[PDB]
Target: Ketone/zingerone synthase 1
Amino acid sequence: VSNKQVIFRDYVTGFPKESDMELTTRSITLKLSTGLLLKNLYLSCDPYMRARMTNSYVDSFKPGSPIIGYGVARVLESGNPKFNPGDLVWGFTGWEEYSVITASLFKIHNTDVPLSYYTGLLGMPGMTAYAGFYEICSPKKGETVYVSAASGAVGQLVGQFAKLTGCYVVGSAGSKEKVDLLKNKFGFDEAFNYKEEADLDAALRRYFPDGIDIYFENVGGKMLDAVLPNMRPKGRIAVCGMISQYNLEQPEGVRNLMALIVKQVRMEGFMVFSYYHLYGKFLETVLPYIKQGKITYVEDVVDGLDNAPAALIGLYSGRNVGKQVVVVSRE
Amino acid sequence: QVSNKQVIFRDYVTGFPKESDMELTTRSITLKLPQGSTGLLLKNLYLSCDPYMRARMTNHHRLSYVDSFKPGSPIIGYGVARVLESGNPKFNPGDLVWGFTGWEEYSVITATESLFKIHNTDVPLSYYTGLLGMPGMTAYAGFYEICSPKKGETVYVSAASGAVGQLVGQFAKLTGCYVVGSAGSKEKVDLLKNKFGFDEAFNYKEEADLDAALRRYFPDGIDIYFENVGGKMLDAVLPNMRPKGRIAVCGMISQYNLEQPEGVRNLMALIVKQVRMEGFMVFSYYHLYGKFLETVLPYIKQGKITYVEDVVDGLDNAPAALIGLYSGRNVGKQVVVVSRE
Ligand SMILES: NC(=O)c1ccc[n+]([C@@H]2O[C@H](COP(=O)([O-])OP(=O)(O)OC[C@H]3O[C@@H](n4cnc5c(N)ncnc54)[C@H](OP(=O)(O)O)[C@@H]3O)[C@@H](O)[C@H]2O)c1
Ligand SMILES: NC(=O)c1ccc[n+]([C@@H]2O[C@H](COP(=O)([O-])OP(=O)(O)OC[C@H]3O[C@@H](n4cnc5c(N)ncnc54)[C@H](OP(=O)(O)O)[C@@H]3O)[C@@H](O)[C@H]2O)c1
Ligand SMILES: CC(=O)CCc1ccc(O)cc1
Model:
C-alpha cells in the first residue's frame, strides 16, 4: 500500500519553516522479525521537537528520514510477545501512515476517552503537568499559582490541578480566545493576554498583590524576569520549558536572579522522562477527575499528514488553541 | 565624658562605593544609660565588613530586605562588643555579645534580640564576626541545608577564600566531597590548596574561558555549586552541572554595584540537567546556631577546621576595608578591630 511520510529535509537554524520538512509517498507491504508494525492514528505536535532539528538530551532527527515523535497507533502485527495485533499504543512513532518500530510504548487499556487524549491529557504532556506540579511545586491549599502558556497542553492541566488543590490560580496566554478559555472553561481565578500587557511586571503585581508562591514556567526570557521579583518568600518555580528561547541562536539573558536570594525561592528544572514510573498513579488520579467532569481538555485538531508541518511550526507562533493534535487516521 | 569616634554614612551611593561616601568624626559621650533605659551600653571591639552592606547604601530597591543606612548617622553592621551597662536583665556588665552595632567606639542598643551572648571565649573574639558569627552560619546552612551533599560528589565554590566560601570548602572536604574553589589572586589560591585543603583551586582572573576552566577542573561535571558571585561565573557553571545537580544561591557579589544586573543566558541547563537552584537567607537558619557551634568548635579545637581573617586596625581604616570587598582587597574574612581584647 501507499505510505505518505513527513520527511526531515535538513537541520534548522532559527525558527523552523515548512520547507524544512518534505511530504513524500513510498510503497510498502504490511507484514514484517522481533519488531512491531503500526498503523498511526494520531500524532502530537510538541514544542521540544524543535530541539531535535539542530545538529542535548536525545538524538537529533536524521535528514532524509521521517520526523519521529509521540503518537497513538494500532498494532497490525508483532514479532514481540508483549503486543498483539489490535492493541492500541502510545509512544514514539514515525510521521507516516505506517511505521515499523524496534521497541518504549504504553498499551492503552481505557478506550472510553477520545484516543487523541493519549497524545496529550493522558500522554506525555499530561504526565509533565502532573510531575511538575505535584512533584516539583509542593503545592498547598491557599497558595497563589501563576501558569505561563496557560491554555496549552501542559498549562491547562497544571491550572486545573492547582484549582483542585485549593490554590489561587492565574494564567496568561497570547489571544483573547485563549484567555476566555482560561476563565470560562478551565476555571482559572484570573487570566490575561500577555501580548496586550505593556508591562508584564505590572500585570503580575496587579494579579498577585501579595506575590506568587508557585510559578509554573513554560516560557522563559522576559516572562521569567517579570515573575522573579514578584515571588513570595519560599516560593517555587518549576522550570518546565522555555519556549521563547527554543528558536534563538543565542538565548536571552535573564537579569533578576538576585530575587532568588531575598525571596528564598527554589527554582528547579525537571524532565518528564524521569517520572514515567508514576504514570500508573497519574492515570489513577486523573481518569476519575475526567469522569466526574472536574478536569477538561481543549485540543486543536488538524486532519492529515499534509498539515502536520504547519501544525508543528505553528506552536512557535501560538497558532494552536490548546493541545496540538494531527489526525493521520481516525480509529 | 569620653570621646566616641564614628564612621558616618555621608550619602546614598550609585555604582561602586568610595572612601568619601563615609566620614570619620569624633563625638563626646557619657558612659551611662538614660534613666529607666531597657537598652544596652556597648563598647565595640570588632566590626565585620560584609558584602551585603552595599545594598544599604542605596535608598530604595524592589528587592530590599532591610532599611537602608541613614545619611548623617553611623554605619551599622555585625560586630562583637562588651556590655558596659544594661537595662535588660538578660545582659549584665562584662557580657560579650555579637550582633548589630554601630560603626563607633560605643553604641547604645535598643533592639537587643539580634544579640547573641558569647559563652566560649576559648577562641579569638574576632571569630564572632565570621567563623562563629553570621558568615559561618551562612556556610553551614547553605551547604548542609540547601546542597544535600553526599560523599564522592563534586563541589565548586566561588569566592572560595572568603568568609563564607573558605568554610563551605572545608565542610565539603569533611563530608568527603571533591572540592574546587576559585579566588582572585595567587595568594588566595595558595590558601585554598595549602591551608584549607581544597582538592584544587584556580584564579578565575587567569581564565579567559571560565566554562573551559570548569571543564578542566570538573571532568565529569559539578554536582553542587555554592554560588557567591553571579553573572558570567554562574553562566559558566550552568552547562557544567550534573543531572540532579544543586546550586545554593548564597550571593551574587559581581552584581551588587551595577545599575542594571547582567543577563544570565544558560538557564535552560536547569531543565536538561534537572538542577535545583535555590536561594536562602541565613536569618532563616539561626535556630540551628547551637547545633552549628557544637559541630564546628571541636573541629577548630582539633585543627580540622581553620580560618583566615583580614584584620585592619582602627575605625579610621574601616571605610577602606568595606570598599575593598568589591575589588577583592580582603584576604579571607574582613575584620576591623575597634579595640583589641
Ligand atoms: N520538561 C519537560 O519534561 C517538558 C515536557 C513537555 C513540555 N515541556 C514544555 O512545556 C511547555 C509547553 O508545552 P506544551 O506542550 O504545553 O505547548 P503548548 O502550550 O500547547 O504550545 C506552545 C505554546 O507556547 C506559546 N508560545 C510560543 N512562543 C512563545 C513566546 N515566544 N512567548 C510566550 N509564549 C509562547 C504559545 O501559546 P500563547 O498563545 O500563549 O503564546 C503556544 O501555543 C514548553 O515550553 C515545552 O517545551 C517540558
Ligand atoms: N544569607 C545569605 O544569603 C548571605 C549571607 C552572607 C553572605 N552572603 C553572600 O555570600 C557571598 C560572600 O560573602 P563573604 O562574606 O564571604 O565575602 P568575602 O568573600 O569574604 O569577600 C568578598 C569577595 O568577593 C570577591 N569578589 C568581589 N567582586 C567580585 C567579582 N566581580 N567577581 C567575583 N568575585 C568577586 C572577592 O574575592 P576574589 O578575590 O576571589 O575576587 C572578595 O574578597 C556574598 O555575595 C554575600 O553577599 C549571603
Ligand atoms: C516529553 C519530552 O520528551 C520532552 C519534554 C520537553 C522537554 C524539554 C523541553 O525543553 C521541552 C519539552
Notes: Residues A 47-48, 124, 241, 271-273; B 271 surround 4-(4-hydroxyphenyl)butan-2-one (ligand 3) (CB under 6 Å). Chain B has two domains: 1-130+308-341, 131-307. The interface with chain A takes residues 62-65, 230, 234, 249-252, 255, 260-281, 284 of chain B (CB under 8 Å).
